[PDB]
Amino acid sequence: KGLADTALKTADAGYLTRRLVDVSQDVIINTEDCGTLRGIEVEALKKNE
DNA sequence: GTCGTTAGTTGTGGGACTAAAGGATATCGTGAACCGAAAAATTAGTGTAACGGGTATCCCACAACGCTAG
Protein backbone atom coordinates (compact mmCIF):
# COMPACT_ATOMS: atom_id res chain seq x y z
CA LYS A 1 0.00 0.00 0.00
CA GLY A 2 2.82 2.40 0.81
CA LEU A 3 4.65 1.58 -2.42
CA ALA A 4 1.47 2.04 -4.47
CA ASP A 5 0.81 5.39 -2.79
CA THR A 6 4.37 6.47 -3.57
CA ALA A 7 4.17 5.30 -7.19
CA LEU A 8 0.70 6.73 -7.92
CA LYS A 9 0.36 9.93 -5.85
CA THR A 10 3.18 11.97 -7.36
CA ALA A 11 1.24 12.69 -10.56
CA ASP A 12 -1.06 14.77 -8.35
CA ALA A 13 1.99 16.61 -6.98
CA GLY A 14 3.23 17.30 -10.50
CA TYR A 15 -0.19 18.54 -11.58
CA LEU A 16 -0.36 20.84 -8.55
CA THR A 17 3.10 22.21 -9.30
CA ARG A 18 2.19 22.81 -12.95
CA ARG A 19 -1.01 24.65 -12.05
CA LEU A 20 0.79 26.71 -9.40
CA VAL A 21 3.58 27.66 -11.81
CA ASP A 22 1.08 28.67 -14.48
CA VAL A 23 -0.98 30.77 -12.05
CA SER A 24 2.15 32.40 -10.56
CA GLN A 25 4.33 32.74 -13.66
CA ASP A 26 3.72 36.46 -14.24
CA VAL A 27 4.48 37.53 -10.65
CA ILE A 28 7.82 39.37 -10.92
CA ILE A 29 9.33 42.12 -8.78
CA ASN A 30 8.93 45.00 -11.24
CA THR A 31 9.34 48.16 -9.12
CA GLU A 32 10.81 49.08 -5.75
CA ASP A 33 7.89 50.52 -3.74
CA CYS A 34 4.12 50.21 -4.21
CA GLY A 35 3.43 53.17 -1.92
CA THR A 36 0.88 51.25 0.12
CA LEU A 37 -0.52 52.00 3.56
CA ARG A 38 -2.08 48.52 3.71
CA GLY A 39 -0.69 45.35 5.21
CA ILE A 40 -1.36 42.21 7.20
CA GLU A 41 -1.17 41.53 10.93
CA VAL A 42 1.32 38.81 11.88
CA GLU A 43 1.32 37.15 15.31
CA ALA A 44 2.65 33.91 16.77
CA LEU A 45 1.17 30.67 15.46
CA LYS A 46 -0.10 28.61 18.40
CA LYS A 47 -1.49 25.08 18.16
CA ASN A 48 -3.17 23.71 21.30
CA GLU A 49 -2.31 27.00 23.02
C1' DG B 1 -58.78 26.34 -12.80
C1' DT B 2 -54.82 27.51 -15.60
C1' DC B 3 -50.26 29.37 -17.23
C1' DG B 4 -45.40 31.23 -16.65
C1' DT B 5 -41.27 31.18 -13.16
C1' DT B 6 -37.73 29.75 -10.15
C1' DA B 7 -34.77 26.71 -7.82
C1' DG B 8 -33.01 22.30 -7.15
C1' DT B 9 -32.04 18.23 -8.95
C1' DT B 10 -30.70 14.63 -12.77
C1' DG B 11 -28.68 12.85 -16.82
C1' DT B 12 -25.30 13.76 -20.05
C1' DG B 13 -21.15 15.75 -22.26
C1' DG B 14 -16.33 17.71 -22.45
C1' DG B 15 -11.62 18.06 -20.14
C1' DA B 16 -7.32 17.10 -16.71
C1' DC B 17 -4.27 12.92 -14.95
C1' DT B 18 5.33 14.27 -12.59
C1' DA B 19 9.76 14.10 -14.46
C1' DA B 20 14.57 10.89 -16.97
C1' DA B 21 15.15 6.54 -20.48
C1' DG B 22 13.30 3.63 -24.82
C1' DG B 23 10.77 3.13 -29.00
C1' DA B 24 10.53 -4.14 -31.92
C1' DT B 25 5.71 -5.50 -33.75
C1' DA B 26 1.05 -7.31 -38.33
C1' DT B 27 -2.03 -6.29 -40.91
C1' DC B 28 -8.16 -12.00 -44.81
C1' DG B 29 -12.02 -12.30 -48.01
C1' DT B 30 -10.92 -12.38 -55.75
C1' DG B 31 -15.04 -11.49 -61.19
C1' DA B 32 -13.94 -11.81 -66.40
C1' DA B 33 -12.58 -10.01 -70.64
C1' DC B 34 -10.88 -6.73 -74.12
C1' DC B 35 -8.62 -2.45 -75.42
C1' DG B 36 -5.29 1.07 -75.00
C1' DA B 37 -0.94 2.92 -73.62
C1' DA B 38 4.04 3.54 -73.79
C1' DA B 39 8.28 1.61 -72.94
C1' DA B 40 11.53 -1.28 -74.71
C1' DA B 41 14.73 -3.89 -78.54
C1' DT B 42 15.93 -4.97 -82.93
C1' DT B 43 17.46 -3.70 -87.35
C1' DA B 44 19.56 -0.80 -91.41
C1' DG B 45 23.02 2.15 -93.11
C1' DT B 46 28.80 4.32 -94.35
C1' DG B 47 34.83 3.41 -94.81
C1' DT B 48 41.98 6.82 -96.47
C1' DA B 49 47.36 7.85 -97.57
C1' DA B 50 50.89 10.76 -99.13
C1' DC B 51 52.01 14.41 -101.34
C1' DG B 52 54.77 20.24 -103.12
C1' DG B 53 56.76 24.25 -100.72
C1' DG B 54 57.02 26.86 -96.36
C1' DT B 55 57.17 27.40 -91.65
C1' DA B 56 55.67 26.93 -86.30
C1' DT B 57 57.66 24.08 -82.52
C1' DC B 58 60.68 20.22 -80.17
C1' DC B 59 65.60 17.59 -78.95
C1' DC B 60 70.59 17.58 -79.67
C1' DA B 61 75.38 19.09 -80.59
C1' DC B 62 78.75 22.83 -81.03
C1' DA B 63 80.84 27.75 -80.82
C1' DA B 64 81.62 32.08 -78.87
C1' DC B 65 90.88 32.03 -81.59
C1' DG B 66 95.23 33.68 -81.20
C1' DC B 67 99.42 35.47 -83.69
C1' DT B 68 102.29 38.09 -87.44
C1' DA B 69 103.16 41.25 -91.06
C1' DG B 70 102.22 45.53 -94.22
| Distance between the alpha carbon (CA) of A8 and the C1' atom of B67, Å | 128
Q: Which nucleotide is nearest to A11 (CA to C1')?
A: B18
Technique used by the depositors: cryo-EM
| Alpha-carbon separation of residue A47 from A2, A44 (angstroms) | 29, 10
Q: Is A34 annotated as a binding residue?
A: yes
Question: What amino acid occupies position A38?
Answer: R
User: What sign does the CA torsion over A31, A34, A40, A41 have?
Assistant: positive
Q: Which nucleotide is nearest to A18 (CA to C1')?
A: B18
User: What is the distance between the alpha carbons of residues A30 and A25, in angstroms, rounded to a whole number?
Assistant: 13
| Distance between the alpha carbon (CA) of A31 and the C1' atom of B45, Å | 97
Categorise residue A35: left if φ over 0, alpha if ψ from -120 to 50, beta otherwise: left
